[PDB]
Each structure stands twice: as C-alpha cells, then as structure tokens.
Design a protein around this motif. Structure first.
Motif, PDB file in Angstrom:
ATOM      1  N   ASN B  19     -86.408  13.846  95.021  1.00  0.00           N
ATOM      2  CA  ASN B  19     -86.229  12.935  93.889  1.00  0.00           C
ATOM      3  C   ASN B  19     -84.880  13.222  93.213  1.00  0.00           C
ATOM      4  O   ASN B  19     -84.640  14.327  92.728  1.00  0.00           O
ATOM      5  CB  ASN B  19     -87.389  13.038  92.895  1.00  0.00           C
ATOM      6  CG  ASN B  19     -87.364  11.927  91.858  1.00  0.00           C
ATOM      7  OD1 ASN B  19     -86.295  11.454  91.459  1.00  0.00           O
ATOM      8  ND2 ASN B  19     -88.546  11.499  91.416  1.00  0.00           N
ATOM      9  N   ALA B  20     -83.992  12.237  93.208  1.00  0.00           N
ATOM     10  CA  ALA B  20     -82.628  12.447  92.714  1.00  0.00           C
ATOM     11  C   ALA B  20     -82.524  12.502  91.190  1.00  0.00           C
ATOM     12  O   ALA B  20     -81.500  12.932  90.657  1.00  0.00           O
ATOM     13  CB  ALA B  20     -81.700  11.379  93.260  1.00  0.00           C
ATOM     14  N   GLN B  21     -83.570  12.055  90.499  1.00  0.00           N
ATOM     15  CA  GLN B  21     -83.564  11.975  89.033  1.00  0.00           C
ATOM     16  C   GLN B  21     -84.183  13.193  88.339  1.00  0.00           C
ATOM     17  O   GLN B  21     -84.218  13.257  87.109  1.00  0.00           O
ATOM     18  CB  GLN B  21     -84.317  10.728  88.565  1.00  0.00           C
ATOM     19  CG  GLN B  21     -83.767   9.410  89.079  1.00  0.00           C
ATOM     20  CD  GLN B  21     -84.431   8.215  88.411  1.00  0.00           C
ATOM     21  OE1 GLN B  21     -84.319   8.029  87.197  1.00  0.00           O
ATOM     22  NE2 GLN B  21     -85.135   7.405  89.200  1.00  0.00           N
ATOM     23  N   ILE B  22     -84.669  14.153  89.121  1.00  0.00           N
ATOM     24  CA  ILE B  22     -85.403  15.296  88.564  1.00  0.00           C
ATOM     25  C   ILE B  22     -84.668  16.600  88.853  1.00  0.00           C
ATOM     26  O   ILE B  22     -84.129  16.780  89.946  1.00  0.00           O
ATOM     27  CB  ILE B  22     -86.860  15.326  89.095  1.00  0.00           C
ATOM     28  CG1 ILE B  22     -87.622  14.084  88.618  1.00  0.00           C
ATOM     29  CG2 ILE B  22     -87.597  16.601  88.667  1.00  0.00           C
ATOM     30  CD1 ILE B  22     -89.074  14.027  89.109  1.00  0.00           C
ATOM     31  N   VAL B  23     -84.609  17.491  87.864  1.00  0.00           N
ATOM     32  CA  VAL B  23     -83.893  18.766  88.006  1.00  0.00           C
ATOM     33  C   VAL B  23     -84.415  19.551  89.212  1.00  0.00           C
ATOM     34  O   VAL B  23     -85.625  19.649  89.400  1.00  0.00           O
ATOM     35  CB  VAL B  23     -83.998  19.622  86.715  1.00  0.00           C
ATOM     36  CG1 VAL B  23     -83.440  21.030  86.932  1.00  0.00           C
ATOM     37  CG2 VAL B  23     -83.262  18.941  85.560  1.00  0.00           C
ATOM     38  N   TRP B  25     -84.129  18.544  92.135  1.00  0.00           N
ATOM     39  CA  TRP B  25     -84.269  17.513  93.158  1.00  0.00           C
ATOM     40  C   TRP B  25     -85.465  17.785  94.057  1.00  0.00           C
ATOM     41  O   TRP B  25     -85.299  17.987  95.261  1.00  0.00           O
ATOM     42  CB  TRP B  25     -82.980  17.415  93.988  1.00  0.00           C
ATOM     43  CG  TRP B  25     -81.746  17.432  93.122  1.00  0.00           C
ATOM     44  CD1 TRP B  25     -81.250  16.397  92.380  1.00  0.00           C
ATOM     45  CD2 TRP B  25     -80.870  18.543  92.897  1.00  0.00           C
ATOM     46  NE1 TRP B  25     -80.110  16.796  91.719  1.00  0.00           N
ATOM     47  CE2 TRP B  25     -79.860  18.111  92.016  1.00  0.00           C
ATOM     48  CE3 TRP B  25     -80.839  19.863  93.357  1.00  0.00           C
ATOM     49  CZ2 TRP B  25     -78.832  18.954  91.586  1.00  0.00           C
ATOM     50  CZ3 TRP B  25     -79.819  20.694  92.932  1.00  0.00           C
ATOM     51  CH2 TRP B  25     -78.827  20.238  92.059  1.00  0.00           C
ATOM     52  N   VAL B  28     -90.392  15.087  97.646  1.00  0.00           N
ATOM     53  CA  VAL B  28     -91.610  14.301  97.492  1.00  0.00           C
ATOM     54  C   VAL B  28     -92.177  13.922  98.862  1.00  0.00           C
ATOM     55  O   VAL B  28     -93.266  13.363  98.963  1.00  0.00           O
ATOM     56  CB  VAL B  28     -91.369  13.017  96.675  1.00  0.00           C
ATOM     57  CG1 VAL B  28     -90.842  13.359  95.288  1.00  0.00           C
ATOM     58  CG2 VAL B  28     -90.383  12.101  97.397  1.00  0.00           C
ATOM     59  N   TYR B  29     -91.424  14.223  99.916  1.00  0.00           N
ATOM     60  CA  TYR B  29     -91.861  13.899 101.279  1.00  0.00           C
ATOM     61  C   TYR B  29     -91.125  14.726 102.336  1.00  0.00           C
ATOM     62  O   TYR B  29     -89.916  14.921 102.252  1.00  0.00           O
ATOM     63  CB  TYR B  29     -91.669  12.403 101.576  1.00  0.00           C
ATOM     64  CG  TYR B  29     -92.176  12.011 102.947  1.00  0.00           C
ATOM     65  CD1 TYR B  29     -93.519  11.729 103.148  1.00  0.00           C
ATOM     66  CD2 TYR B  29     -91.324  11.958 104.043  1.00  0.00           C
ATOM     67  CE1 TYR B  29     -94.002  11.386 104.394  1.00  0.00           C
ATOM     68  CE2 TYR B  29     -91.801  11.614 105.303  1.00  0.00           C
ATOM     69  CZ  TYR B  29     -93.138  11.334 105.468  1.00  0.00           C
ATOM     70  OH  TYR B  29     -93.621  10.990 106.711  1.00  0.00           O
ATOM     71  N   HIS B  41     -95.931  24.180 106.209  1.00  0.00           N
ATOM     72  CA  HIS B  41     -96.887  23.087 106.071  1.00  0.00           C
ATOM     73  C   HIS B  41     -96.361  22.072 105.056  1.00  0.00           C
ATOM     74  O   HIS B  41     -95.709  22.427 104.079  1.00  0.00           O
ATOM     75  CB  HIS B  41     -98.233  23.656 105.604  1.00  0.00           C
ATOM     76  CG  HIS B  41     -99.378  22.696 105.700  1.00  0.00           C
ATOM     77  ND1 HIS B  41     -99.476  21.568 104.914  1.00  0.00           N
ATOM     78  CD2 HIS B  41    -100.497  22.720 106.464  1.00  0.00           C
ATOM     79  CE1 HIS B  41    -100.594  20.924 105.205  1.00  0.00           C
ATOM     80  NE2 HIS B  41    -101.233  21.603 106.142  1.00  0.00           N
ATOM     81  N   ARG B  42     -96.639  20.797 105.292  1.00  0.00           N
ATOM     82  CA  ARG B  42     -96.205  19.740 104.398  1.00  0.00           C
ATOM     83  C   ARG B  42     -96.643  19.999 102.947  1.00  0.00           C
ATOM     84  O   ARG B  42     -95.889  19.751 102.009  1.00  0.00           O
ATOM     85  CB  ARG B  42     -96.746  18.410 104.932  1.00  0.00           C
ATOM     86  CG  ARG B  42     -97.007  17.354 103.910  1.00  0.00           C
ATOM     87  CD  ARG B  42     -98.043  16.383 104.436  1.00  0.00           C
ATOM     88  NE  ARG B  42     -97.904  16.138 105.868  1.00  0.00           N
ATOM     89  CZ  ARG B  42     -98.905  16.202 106.744  1.00  0.00           C
ATOM     90  NH1 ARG B  42    -100.136  16.500 106.343  1.00  0.00           N
ATOM     91  NH2 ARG B  42     -98.678  15.966 108.030  1.00  0.00           N
ATOM     92  N   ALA B  43     -97.851  20.527 102.765  1.00  0.00           N
ATOM     93  CA  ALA B  43     -98.377  20.773 101.423  1.00  0.00           C
ATOM     94  C   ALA B  43     -97.583  21.840 100.657  1.00  0.00           C
ATOM     95  O   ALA B  43     -97.430  21.746  99.439  1.00  0.00           O
ATOM     96  CB  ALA B  43     -99.864  21.135 101.493  1.00  0.00           C
ATOM     97  N   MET B  46     -93.926  20.383  99.591  1.00  0.00           N
ATOM     98  CA  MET B  46     -93.992  19.437  98.469  1.00  0.00           C
ATOM     99  C   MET B  46     -93.543  20.082  97.154  1.00  0.00           C
ATOM    100  O   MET B  46     -94.007  21.167  96.801  1.00  0.00           O
ATOM    101  CB  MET B  46     -95.428  18.898  98.341  1.00  0.00           C
ATOM    102  CG  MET B  46     -95.557  17.525  97.714  1.00  0.00           C
ATOM    103  SD  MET B  46     -94.717  16.218  98.636  1.00  0.00           S
ATOM    104  CE  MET B  46     -96.054  15.577  99.649  1.00  0.00           C
ATOM    105  N   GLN B  47     -92.613  19.420  96.464  1.00  0.00           N
ATOM    106  CA  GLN B  47     -92.077  19.856  95.166  1.00  0.00           C
ATOM    107  C   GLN B  47     -91.150  21.087  95.197  1.00  0.00           C
ATOM    108  O   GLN B  47     -90.678  21.531  94.141  1.00  0.00           O
ATOM    109  CB  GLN B  47     -93.186  20.005  94.102  1.00  0.00           C
ATOM    110  CG  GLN B  47     -93.740  18.658  93.590  1.00  0.00           C
ATOM    111  CD  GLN B  47     -92.714  17.840  92.802  1.00  0.00           C
ATOM    112  OE1 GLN B  47     -92.124  18.332  91.842  1.00  0.00           O
ATOM    113  NE2 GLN B  47     -92.504  16.584  93.205  1.00  0.00           N
TER     114      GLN B  47
END
Lengths: 173, 121
Positions: B19-23, B25, B28-29, B41-43, B46-47
């Motif tokens: 996400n380009a708008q969040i400190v 970055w 999300v995928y 793992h994908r989980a 994430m974040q």
C-alpha cells in the motif's frame, strides 16, 4: 454485511445423501490441509454444517463492528479487507479469514470491512457448530487447528499511519 | 480497482503489492511465486513492509537498503540487487524491481515489487 442474512445458504439440503453432501464440499475438504485426516463420520458432520455465500462486486461480507461467528474460506473470487478507509489485505482463492480465537471464543466483533472485488463464493462454517465436531473428534481437533492458519484475523485492529497524516503532523511541530 | 488489475497476470513472476499511502508501505498481497521464492507463508508476509526489511540480515548491504527505501519515498521505478534471507535463513542474492502504480487520477496507490533469485534462469 452478507453474513448473518438470507444470503448465506446451506450447502446441503438436510435430506441429501451424506456422501453426496461431502462431495459438495470438496473445494474446501480436498484442498485445505486442515481437513486431511478426518474420518468419514467427521467429514459428514462438517459437510452438513457448511454454508456458502455468493457475493457481487462491491458487496460486503462483513462490516466493521459486525459480529464474526464463522470461519470463512474463499473458494472463488477476490476480496479486499479495508480498515480506516485503507486496503490492508487482498484475499483470494484458498484464503481463510475470521477470528484467530475461533476455537475458544464465542464471538469477535470485526475490526474491518470485507468487500468483494469480483463475484465471490465463500464456504463458511459457524464456529459453534465446528467446535461441537472438534470436541468429539479429538485427534482431528489437534490436526485441524495445527493446520488452520488465517490469512486475515478480523478481531485485531492493525496499527498503522497514513503517510500524509505524518507529513502534516511533522510540518506542525 | 488498481489492486485487482495488477494481480493479473502472474506472468510466472514473484511479486508483492504494497500500500503506497501507508507508512512502511505494508504488503496487502503476495503471490504463490513470492511465497515459494522467499520461503514465507502468505499469512506471515501480509502487512510486512514491501521494502522487505523482514528479510534483511547481517550480510544485507545497508547502502542498498537506503536506496530501496528512497525509491519508495520518491515514488520512483528502480531495480536493485540485494542480499536477503529466505525464511530458512539461507542468504540469497535477489534482483528486485520496484514500480509505483497509479490509479486513473494518477495518484500512486500501490507499489508493485517483483523478485527473482539471480542464480535462477
């Protein structure tokens, strides 16, 4: 959100032959490793409890603040998880979401909206019905919870800041 | 929208979307390819920051780290080679391309970050 409404359909009619019902659940049962070692009696019990939700693009599965009482498996389509008006996750086929504490907690209140990006199909099971099964199939309960990893946990707020709010709050100190 | 549009197509590439708008970055995928390549793992991906600080280690070049970070801060498209650590702790040289992705209103909404092991072919 669609959860908790008439949009949530039973996968199996109650008089459906048990083995056909298990077959109707294959997209989850044969693909997700958490179901690996279930006895036939166990698969049949789970199959009769599973429900399905079909959403159109833009439909909400959950709104923030709504009660989360089910484990949700994405079987087709893509969804976005939105918190404080920002995308915090994109979910797709194979992803599982719900309450990290699904095993012991009755309810969680969602911290995020979950919105379909495409036409989406979910298979969902209420955690009280799941727990009744796992309390009987004790060995399965161990292997199931071991291998059930959520891609997104709706119970927890993500702590983040927007770059623009930091920039302003910088300029003003 | 811009997020869904990007997810297709994998093109046999390994990528994440930040996400380009969040400190920091946050990712999300991440696709199967990235998860296979990185070992994560994908989980758990994430974040995490899409600059991949979660994969840095002792041998990672701190000057390269700063240039990667600057790419995100300036919304630029650049490529780097960086030594990072797979989940199994093996240090791997990655070729990393970072591309800011803009919506219809030309605002940067996400970073498309693509990865490859340089010894693969």
């Amino acid at each position: 959100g669609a959860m908790g409404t008439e949009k949530v359909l039973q996968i199996c009619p109650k008089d459906m032959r048990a083995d056909i019902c298990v077959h109707l659940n294959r997209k989850v049962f044969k693909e997700h490793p958490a179901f690996r070692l279930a006895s036939d009696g166990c698969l049949r019990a789970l199959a009769m409890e599973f429900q399905t939700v079909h959403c159109a693009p833009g439909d909400l599965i959950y709104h923030a603040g709504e009660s989360v009482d089910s484990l949700c498996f994405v079987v087709s389509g893509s969804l976005e998880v939105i918190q404080d008006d920002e995308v915090v996750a994109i979910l797709g086929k194979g992803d599982v979401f719900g309450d990290v504490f699904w095993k012991e907690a009755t309810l969680a209140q969602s911290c995020a909206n979950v919105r379909a990006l495409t036409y989406c199909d979910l298979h969902v099971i209420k955690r009280d019905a799941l727990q009744k099964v796992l309390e009987f199939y004790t060995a399965f309960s161990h292997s199931f919870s071991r291998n059930l990893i959520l891609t997104y946990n709706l119970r927890k707020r993500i702590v983040f800041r927007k770059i623009s709010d930091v920039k302003r709050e910088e300029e003003e100190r | 929208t811009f997020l869904e549009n990007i997810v297709r197509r994998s093109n046999d590439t390994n990528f994440v979307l930040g996400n380009a708008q969040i400190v920091d970055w946050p990712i999300v995928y991440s696709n199967d390819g990235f998860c296979k390549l990185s070992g994560y793992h994908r989980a758990e991906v994430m974040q995490k920051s899409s600059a991949c600080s979660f994969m840095y280690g002792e041998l990672t070049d701190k000057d390269t780290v700063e240039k990667v970070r600057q790419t995100f801060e300036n919304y630029e498209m650049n490529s780097f080679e960086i030594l990072m650590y797979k989940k199994n702790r093996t240090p791997v040289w990655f070729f990393v391309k970072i591309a800011p992705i803009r919506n219809e209103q030309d605002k940067v909404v996400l970073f498309l970050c693509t990865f490859s092991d340089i010894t693969a072919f």
